[PDB]
Paper text:
mediated by the ‘linchpin’ residue N255. place via microtubule interactions of the N255 ‘linchpin’ residue. relax into its open state and release ADP. substantial loss of ADP affinity that occurs with microtubule attachment. However, the no-nucleotide conformation proposed by Atherton et al.
Residue numbers in the entry:
A (entry chain K): 5 to 320
B (entry chain B): 1 to 44, 47 to 360, 369 to 441
C (entry chain A): 1 to 38, 46 to 437
The structure:
């Protein structure tokens, strides 16, 4: 529901470099719920192990989110993790593979087969917008050469990203092609070790309309999928000023997000939304009629030991 | 870092700035005509924090003076600081917004903010280790409001990496005369709470009360209100402006002062606010100055401290004393006044000590506080904004100059969240 | 002869540094012109360059400078050589993310290279004295980084830390436990032996013991300096053992994690009692166990005692020294903990204390510095524990520190190790 926020963690398996080079497997699973990572337990909703299926994952996690987006609520899904953590496979996977495909092509599938199930009373009209936050400002992931967008609260006092390209989307292929031009236009940075380093939190909003010709009611369904960048120790990376500018921006907004989840998880007094620009756009998505899933993406390798830790320590 | 740059925004921003400058000049031993006629080299030393150099003996204030229509620049050039300002830094313009915030941030001011962006860029590119902008800002005016905010926004877009420290005049709904003020203030705050780093709020009624009742000036003229703003603007810069005992910088204040990031509406205060006379001596000796500073109505915004609570409080002492009261009275006043200070911040009071007092005086204090009572000031502005907006009043002002209904609503909704936010930390506690 | 580099960083660690070196100037007889006037050989801390110029091994490191200005223009300008005066520019006062990460990066090399250079000019290196403001912004952000460096760049030589952990009352940052926690996590790995410094007891002591009114930090630095200087006197001045840095470490804290000791100096007294009575070797040693006279105002009454190392500097009689300690050890009902074996380690040096031309202590004869470790530091660690959780549960301030350069993870990790460190000081029993 709203109250029960699905904090999940999903460990990838070890890779042939991690297996041959021999950074070991950290986890000691207590259960479905709880894992021991290096001395300290971390309890969550669901710890998916490295032996889990994409189908099991999606159906426990994602499938009900979509039904609820559809049936009267909105939904959020958050994906948190660093480069090579296994975020690619969890959030996207590979669409030609019916096993291998993840959260975004499975949502495109159950959304469009929700379309192809019902008949001509609901008028399904999906619009999508794709935008990144990069050095404070909101860049449009679709349309090139903008400075900032305006994220306006309406008469219902809900944030609409004004200035963005909304894509009136009609085919599940069109959904997908969108991601590809989008991801191409992203601010990723390439270093020598860190190749696809994500320097933007990116918000994908699938606005599913379904307004009934019959019952006349204005039926809708906003799904926010938020691509969360990974939290970076500049003691670790050692970088330059311009790359540190990014890394503090990430860390700040991430941490501010955890303060709202903490205040949401508390059910506190103010429950902030205003100060972080991300929590501003996701004002109602954090704190409203939202069924919300946080998918944590970690390595079980001893390379990324303090990264897993730092990430798991999120969930309060 | 080193160089603070100063910006005078609004007819008052000009005035209160020019007095600030008058003070700091006199303080570092510079004549308001031009020359360093000064004695103390220690008081000379860190001049570049505010001043630009010039012909060796003259020092140039690194001011940017913003005013929409002409005439204000003419008043300051006319004034006894006059010639100490370099005429390039008179950033005047032609046509006016006349209080109207929309007219200011959208319409008119657009021609001038390229100009100003040029000038501040020039002085910022002029600097060694750029510290921050300290902007004297008529919060509910038009030149200060809509243009000063438009500028803050250009300044922020340009420099995230510098300290945007504002001194922001927002008087009460009791003594104020500017009509559309409740609109100008909401629109201005909607930019400020998003944009600025540390906003030190100031009230003319509080300055009036300080003069009339605490100090006992007969007629509180503007330059009198300036005497007190300039003193606290002088206060807050003190420790980086001179060598002392302890810390310096305004960020070292601010990092301590703001517990969550939008709680940046500060309340300064000054002391000795003693009537001019002989006893005086049996008003305050040294420890007793702290007892004055910690007292109720001494504050540049008039917050009755029984009415809210405090978050972080800091205190800039100027004069050659010990942390004796900073040991003793800061303990005892947090012990006894326990109701006032929020118990979630482990020991709330944050003192520095600078050796140099104000020129001629012996011990001064600057209070710098985050008073949760500040939200009543916002509550009434938000009321009056609701009233005017609910009436649909002043269309032939704002909406004519292109203000949007969503951005009215937003600024309101932001201001009410600011209220709810400052109020939650009033409410908030320890275990 | 065995050459000890004193590094001092922070507002206070610099200031206090300056007083340390001013009493070392006076103890060793250097005039502010640079010149030793007569025949002595204090080449530990000082060195004569060729002309009559004794240059210290004092490394002043700072941000935007205060004291270095006052030093090279005015205060022993002709003693301190400008190459050893390391100024900085950008800001981090309070802010640990700007300290240990951002501005620390821009600093480190210019500082480190200067250190490697002085340590090149130290031929017979004894090791480091590192003086720093532990909870401070100017201090600990960069010094925790500097120690991280010198743990490799120096290797097996020891870092003798003096660590200003704040008073339960006098508190100039709000975020001083955030500093100190992160600072502790760092020194837990990269410091050799850590002398926890206060403000409170020290000020308490000036009013109770010293009986001057409520003095300025200048006089109070002249208190600390007396205490640092007595520690170093045993290297500086000739006499018994306790020359090595390792001679403290090894003697004090042989349990590897338990590396913060405490200390005190005596006689601290009034010029009145100086005239009025003459203190005996027993009475100064009885002042060594005195609870009110102890350096960090953590309570020795509620605490139990661990190791005890006593440095006597003055003409003392070793029998009477053996008796003072024998008797007071035998007699006082203080718990010497059952984990420690029984015994003090004593140290008697010829040279008496030296007094400053100031407004401070008078010309006493015989003098002692108690080094100890006691369980009472856990009380100090309790304030950290209380105070941290009090903001952290709130998540106050985190927009300044995690927002500007720190990672949030790092806060919990240090919370866990500090807490295990309280379990370390709780492993003090049988
Ligand atoms: N004994 C002593 N204490 C001092 C002196 N100067 C400051 N202190 C205080 O003792 C503690 C030392 O911290 P600081 O040195 O001020 O911390 P800092 O490194 O300057 O940290 P920032 O102010 O954040 O840059 C503070 O609470 C000071 O107020 C001094 O000369 N001696
Ligand atoms: N403290 C102070 N207040 C003043 C002074 N002169 C005018 N005021 C008041 O403070 C506000 C100044 O507004 P102004 O600077 O005119 O706003 P602008 O329209 O943006 O130029 C008004 O409400 C004035 O009555 C002065 O020198 N000092």
């Amino acid at each position: 529901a709203e109250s029960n926020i699905k904090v999940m963690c999903r460990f990838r398996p070890l890779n042939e470099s991690e297996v041959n080079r021999g950074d070991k497997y950290i986890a000691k699973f207590q259960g479905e719920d709880t894992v021991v990572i290096a001395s300290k337990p971390y309890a969550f909703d669901r710890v998916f192990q490295s032996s889990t299926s994409q189908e099991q994952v999606y159906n426990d996690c994602a499938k009900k989110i979509v039904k609820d987006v559809l049936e009267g609520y909105n939904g959020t899904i958050f994906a948190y993790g660093q480069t090579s953590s296994g975020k690619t496979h969890t959030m996207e996977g590979k669409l030609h593979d019916p096993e291998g495909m993840g959260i975004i092509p499975r949502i495109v599938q159950d959304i469009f087969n929700y379309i192809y199930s019902m008949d001509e009373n609901l008028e399904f009209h999906i619009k999508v917008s794709y935008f990144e936050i990069y050095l404070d400002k909101i860049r449009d992931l679709l349309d090139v050469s903008k400075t900032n967008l305006s994220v306006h609260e309406d008469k219902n006092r809900v944030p609409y990203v004004k200035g963005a390209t909304e894509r009136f989307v009609s085919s599940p292929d069109e959904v997908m092609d969108t991601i590809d031009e989008g991801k191409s236009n992203r601010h990723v940075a390439v270093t020598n070790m860190n190749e696809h380093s994500s320097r933007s939190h990116s918000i994908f909003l699938i606005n599913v309309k379904q307004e009934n010709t019959q019952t006349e009611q204005k039926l809708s369904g906003k799904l926010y999928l938020v691509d969360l960048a990974g939290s970076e120790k500049v003691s670790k990376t050692g970088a330059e000023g311009a790359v540190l500018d990014e890394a503090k921006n990430i860390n700040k907004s991430l941490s501010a997000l955890g303060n709202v989840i903490s205040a949401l998880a508390e059910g506190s007094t103010y429950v902030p939304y205003r100060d972080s620009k991300m929590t501003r756009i996701l004002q109602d998505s954090l704190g409203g009629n939202c069924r919300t899933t946080i998918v944590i993406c970690c390595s079980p390798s001893s390379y990324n030991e303090s990264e897993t830790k730092s990430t798991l320590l999120f969930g309060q | 870092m080193r160089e603070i740059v100063h910006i005078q925004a609004g007819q008052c921003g000009n005035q209160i700035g020019a007095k600030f400058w008058e003070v700091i000049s006199d303080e570092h031993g510079i004549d308001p005509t031009g020359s360093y006629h000064g004695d103390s080299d220690l008081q000379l030393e860190r001049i570049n924090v505010y001043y630009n150099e010039a012909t060796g003996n003259k020092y140039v204030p690194r001011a940017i003076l913003v005013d929409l229509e002409p005439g204000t620049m003419d008043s300051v050039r006319s004034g006894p600081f006059g010639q100490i300002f370099r005429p390039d830094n008179f950033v005047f313009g032609q046509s006016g917004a006349g209080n109207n915030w929309a007219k200011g941030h959208y319409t008119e001011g657009a021609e001038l903010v390229d100009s100003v962006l040029d000038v501040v860029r020039k002085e910022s590119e002029s600097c060694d280790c750029l510290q921050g902008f300290q902007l004297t800002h008529s919060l509910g005016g038009g030149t200060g409001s809509g243009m000063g905010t438009l500028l803050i926004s250009k300044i922020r877009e340009e420099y995230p990496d510098r300290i945007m420290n504002t001194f922001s005049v927002m008087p009460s709904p009791k003594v104020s005369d500017t009509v559309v003020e409740p609109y100008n203030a909401t629109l201005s705050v909607h930019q400020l709470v998003e944009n600025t780093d540390e906003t030190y709020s100031i009230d003319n009624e509080a300055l009036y009360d300080i003069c009339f009742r605490t100090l006992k000036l007969t007629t509180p003229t503007y330059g009198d209100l300036n005497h007190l703003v300039s003193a606290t603007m002088s206060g807050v810069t003190t420790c980086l402006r001179f060598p002392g005992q302890l810390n310096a910088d305004l960020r070292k204040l601010a990092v301590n002062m703001v517990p969550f990031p939008r709680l940046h509406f500060f309340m300064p205060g000054f002391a000795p606010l003693t009537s001019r006379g002989s006893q005086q001596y049996r008003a305050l000796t040294v420890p007793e100055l702290t007892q004055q500073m910690f007292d109720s109505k001494n504050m540049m915004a008039a917050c009755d401290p029984r009415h809210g609570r405090y978050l972080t409080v800091a205190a800039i002492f100027r004069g050659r004393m010990s942390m004796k009261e900073v040991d003793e009275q800061m303990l005892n006043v947090q012990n006894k006044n326990s109701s006032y200070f929020v118990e979630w911040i482990p020991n709330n009071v944050k003192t520095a000590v600078c050796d140099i007092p104000p020129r001629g005086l012996k011990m001064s204090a600057t209070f710098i506080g985050n008073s949760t009572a500040i939200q009543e000031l916002f509550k009434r502005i938000s009321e009056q904004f609701t009233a005017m907006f609910r009436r649909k009043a002043f269309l032939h002002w704002y909406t004519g100059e292109g203000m949007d209904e969503m951005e009215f609503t937003e600024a309101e909704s932001n201001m009410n969240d600011l209220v709810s936010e400052y109020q939650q930390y009033q409410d908030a506690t320890a275990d | 002869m065995r050459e000890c580099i004193s590094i001092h960083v922070g507002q206070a660690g610099v200031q206090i540094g300056n007083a340390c070196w001013e009493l070392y100037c006076l103890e060793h007889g250097i005039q502010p012109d640079g010149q030793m006037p007569s025949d002595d050989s204090f080449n530990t801390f000082f060195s004569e360059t060729g002309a009559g110029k004794h240059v210290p091994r004092a490394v002043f490191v700072d941000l935007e400078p205060t004291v270095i200005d006052e030093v090279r223009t005015g205060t022993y300008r002709q003693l301190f050589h400008p190459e050893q005066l390391i100024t900085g520019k950008e800001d981090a006062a309070n802010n640990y993310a700007r300290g240990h990460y951002t501005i620390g990066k821009e600093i480190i090399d210019l500082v480190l290279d200067r250190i490697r250079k002085l340590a090149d000019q130290c031929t017979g290196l004894q090791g480091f004295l590192v003086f720093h403001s532990f909870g401070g912004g100017t201090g600990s952000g960069f010094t925790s980084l500097l120690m991280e460096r010198l743990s490799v760049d120096y290797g097996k030589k020891s870092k003798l830390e003096f660590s200003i952990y704040p008073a339960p009352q006098v508190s100039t940052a709000v975020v001083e436990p955030y500093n100190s926690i992160l600072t502790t996590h760092t020194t837990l790995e990269h410091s050799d032996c850590a002398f926890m410094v206060d403000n409170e007891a020290i000020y308490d002591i000036c009013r109770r013991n010293l009986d001057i009114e409520r003095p300025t930090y200048t006089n109070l630095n002249r208190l600390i300096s007396q205490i640092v200087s007595s520690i170093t006197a045993s290297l500086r001045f000739d006499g018994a053992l306790n020359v090595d840095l390792t001679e403290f470490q090894t003697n004090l804290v042989p349990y590897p994690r338990i590396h913060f000791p405490l200390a005190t100096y005596a006689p601290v007294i009034s010029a009145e009692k100086a005239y009025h009575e003459q203190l005996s070797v027993a009475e100064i040693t009885n002042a060594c166990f005195e609870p009110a006279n102890q350096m960090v105002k953590c309570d020795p009454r509620h605490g139990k005692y661990m190791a005890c190392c006593l440095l006597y500097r003055g003409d003392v009689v070793p029998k009477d020294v053996n008796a003072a300690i024998a008797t007071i050890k035998t007699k006082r009902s203080i718990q010497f903990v059952d984990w420690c074996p029984t015994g003090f380690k004593v140290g008697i040096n010829y040279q008496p204390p030296t007094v400053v031309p100031g407004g401070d202590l008078a010309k006493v004869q015989r003098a002692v510095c108690m080094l100890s470790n006691t369980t009472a530091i856990a009380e100090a660690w309790a304030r950290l524990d209380h105070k941290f959780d009090l903001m952290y549960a709130k998540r106050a301030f985190v927009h300044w520190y995690v927002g500007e350069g720190m990672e949030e993870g790092e806060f919990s990790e240090a919370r866990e190790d500090m807490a295990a460190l309280e379990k370390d000081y709780e492993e003090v029993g049988v």
